[PDB]
Every structure is written in C-alpha cells, then in structure tokens.
Design a protein around this ligand. Sequence first.
Ligand SMILES: [Zn+2]
Ligand SMILES: [Zn+2]
Length: 62
Amino acid sequence: NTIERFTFPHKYKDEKCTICLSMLEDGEDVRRLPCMHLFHQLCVDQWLAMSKKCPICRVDIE
Ligand SMILES: [Zn+2]
Ligand SMILES: [Zn+2]
C-alpha cells in the first residue's frame, strides 16, 4: 500500500529479525526501511502499514 512506496521488499541473501527473534535466512521475504533496519515481511508488514514507523528506531518511513 503506502508501505511499498517507502520501503524495500526483497529476498534475503548473521542478522536477526527483532520482531520474531529468528535469524534472517537465505530466500526469506524481508524488507528494508529508509533507516536501513531490516525485518521479515511477515513480521513487520501489517504493523508497519498502521504505524508507518520503524519498530526499532521509531523514525517515520514517510
Ligand atoms: Zn521476523
Ligand atoms: Zn529503524
């Protein structure tokens, strides 16, 4: 929605998702925010569409 305009969805190629606490693994659908923080799409996309801010650093993606 608004999410895709301001962030970078892509396939991942040791980093941890801070939402689910699991390691980011090869081929997983992940998303980078303008602040450079990285999350699984599953974990972040619904929350982010509503908050429009990075869970970690609180910076608005817009
Ligand atoms: Zn996750
Ligand atoms: Zn951030």
